[PDB]
Amino acid sequence: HGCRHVAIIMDGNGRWAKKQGKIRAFGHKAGAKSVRRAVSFAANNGIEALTLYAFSAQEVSALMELFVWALDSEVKSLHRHNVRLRIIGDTSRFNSRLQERIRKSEALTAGNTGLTLNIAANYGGRWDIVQGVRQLAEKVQQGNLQPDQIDEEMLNQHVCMHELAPVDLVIRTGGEHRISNFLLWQIAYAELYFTDVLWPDFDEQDFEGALNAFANRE
Amino acid sequence: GCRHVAIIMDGNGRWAKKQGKIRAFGHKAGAKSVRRAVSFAANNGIEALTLYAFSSSALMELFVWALDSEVKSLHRHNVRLRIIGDTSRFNSRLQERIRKSEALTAGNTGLTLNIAANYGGRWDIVQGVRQLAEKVQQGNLQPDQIDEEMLNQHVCMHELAPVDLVIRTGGEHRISNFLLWQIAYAELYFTDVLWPDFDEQDFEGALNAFANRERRF
Numbered sequence: 001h002g003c004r005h006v007a008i009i010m011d012g013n014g015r016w017a018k019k020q021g022k023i024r025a026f027g028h029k030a031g032a033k034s035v036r037r038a039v040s041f042a043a044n045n046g047i048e049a050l051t052l053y054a055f056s057a058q059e060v061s062a063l064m065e066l067f068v069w070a071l072d073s074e075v076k077s078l079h080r081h082n083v084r085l086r087i088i089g090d091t092s093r094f095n096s097r098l099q100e101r102i103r104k105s106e107a108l109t110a111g112n113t114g115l116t117l118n119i120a121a122n123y124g125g126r127w128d129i130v131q132g133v134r135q136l137a138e139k140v141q142q143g144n145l146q147p148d149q150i151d152e153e154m155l156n157q158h159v160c161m162h163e164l165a166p167v168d169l170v171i172r173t174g175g176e177h178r179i180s181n182f183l184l185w186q187i188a189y190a191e192l193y194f195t196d197v198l199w200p201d202f203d204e205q206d207f208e209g210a211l212n213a214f215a216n217r218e
Numbered sequence: 219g220c221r222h223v224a225i226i227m228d229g230n231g232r233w234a235k236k237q238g239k240i241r242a243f244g245h246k247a248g249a250k251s252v253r254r255a256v257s258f259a260a261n262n263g264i265e266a267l268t269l270y271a272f273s274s275s276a277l278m279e280l281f282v283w284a285l286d287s288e289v290k291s292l293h294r295h296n297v298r299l300r301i302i303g304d305t306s307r308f309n310s311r312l313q314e315r316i317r318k319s320e321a322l323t324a325g326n327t328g329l330t331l332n333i334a335a336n337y338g339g340r341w342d343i344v345q346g347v348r349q350l351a352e353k354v355q356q357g358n359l360q361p362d363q364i365d366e367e368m369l370n371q372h373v374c375m376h377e378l379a380p381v382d383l384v385i386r387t388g389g390e391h392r393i394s395n396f397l398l399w400q401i402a403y404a405e406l407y408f409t410d411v412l413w414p415d416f417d418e419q420d421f422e423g424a425l426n427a428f429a430n431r432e433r434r435f
């Protein structure tokens with residue numbers, strides 16, 4: 001398929017549950033179930049990297065804590081499937097507990113030869129670029145880099161997922177046709193694939209539809 | 219209410235071939251397709267229209283000629299012209315015609331027509347970064363005082379309404395290093411129609427599409 005890195009904006013969980021006459025909890029359950037199925041397909045299909053983003057003030061900060069807490073149960077199962085785990089996003093405003101709980105994770109799986117999975121939490125694409133810019137701002141304040149020296153190639157080394165294959169394909173489920181400030185810098189050349197299917201119903205045959213669409217769109 | 223539309227014009231060559239004609243025959247049709255798109259945007263209350271030609275010294279001269287021969291009309295139609303992109307390596311005459319074309323129509327209140335010229339989305343961001351890095355050297359700025367809004371004031375078209383809709387003709391589904399920072403929230407519309415055939419009807423439907431989706435989401 002000539003597809004190395006896949007990014008998915010997951011969406012439709014709430015909508016999926018409403019149609020079934022169910023409450024959000026039931027949808028998240030079906031969503032998470034869909035997250036496992038998607039990873040699996042990535043591993044079993046030589047995909048190199050898979051980046052996921054769950055699309056939706058105080059609660060938010062809490063919701064991210066439930067996320068880190070749950071992101072503790074599944075880590076073990078991930079190592080066992082030979083998956084390297086990366087967590088992009090603004091994890092700097094997160095307490096020191098969850099952060100170790102993160103590097104522990106990335107540390108542990110760090111050496112797998114399986115798929116590289118990255119999960120966005122408190123991620124922004126403008127912010128992503130910003131914080132890459134802040135790193136260059138520091139080098140300039142130190143006195144080692146001249147403004148006119150900064151080029152695309154340089155800044156690209158400072159944004160999320162620089163060590164990885166560039167994103168070849170972005171898939172958005174749930175019907176909306178917006179990037180909604182997920183990856184910006186990283187998708188300058190990516191194939192954009194939008195589908196009406198709601199996330200919980202997104203499956204292998206749907207992930208195949210997109211890789212075939214990408215492969216054929218060459 | 220779609221205020222700012224961005225278009226990636228593509229499929230001029232493919233279009234020619236289909237007629238079994240040469241690459242130049244399609245450029246001619248593309249240019250008519252550009253005029254019609256601009257009449258439409260302006261006749262329909264759009265604030266800004268951003269055009270990006272997609273390709274895969276002769277050119278710099280057709281540039282001067284297009285500007286020389288087409289700017290009086292844009293001005294009569296009250297269109298405000300802007301060229302976005304790196305115009306630094308263009309011979310000074312082109313650079314001077316561009317500056318004057320802009321300066322001529324700077325004050326118009328009609329539609330603002332932004333023409334991408336040797337523009338790249340990452341470049342746009344990088345140049346903004348360079349401006350900020352000068353103010354960090356000048357010691358007027360501290361690294362942790364940079365935020366999305368600050369970066370936002372130095373990316374192309376920061377002074378205009380945010381881009382609401384990006385239309386790409388020609389069938390490919392990529393942004394291809396066109397606007398990047400600017401489309402974090404834009405509607406993205408893909409159509410297989412080829413740029414020279416893309417018309418007032420194709421346009422109306424993209425806009426309608428935007429409306430219905432703006433209503434659903």
Ligand SMILES: O=P(O)(O)C(O)(COc1cccc(-c2cccc(-c3ccccc3)c2)c1)P(=O)(O)O
Nearest residue numbers: 035036039040043044074075077078081083117119
């Ligand atoms: O390759 P198989 O046929 O042995 C199998 O499909 C592999 O199952 C997995 C493959 C890839 C990833 C997982 C997995 C398990 C548990 C949690 C997660 C996980 C994925 C994404 C975010 C958090 C957690 C993934 C399981 P199985 O069902 O575990 O036997």
Ligand SMILES: O=P(O)(O)C(O)(COc1cccc(-c2cccc(-c3ccccc3)c2)c1)P(=O)(O)O
Nearest residue numbers: 010012013014015024028031032054055056063066
């Ligand atoms: O469409 P929404 O507003 O129901 C939502 O975007 C759905 O997004 C998800 C997609 C896939 C997986 C999840 C998810 C997995 C596991 C736990 C949770 C979760 C747990 C507790 C509270 C909120 C979310 C979410 C969420 P949200 O993040 O749950 O609000």
Ligand SMILES: O=P(O)(O)C(O)(COc1cccc(-c2cccc(-c3ccccc3)c2)c1)P(=O)(O)O
Nearest residue numbers: 252253254256257258260261288289291292295297
């Ligand atoms: O002949 P009509 O009825 O289509 C009409 O002239 C259209 O008016 C226009 C509005 C805005 C811009 C134009 C226009 C005219 C000629 C050239 C260009 C032009 C567009 C893009 C690049 C270079 C030139 C735009 C015309 P009018 O506004 O309805 O009088």
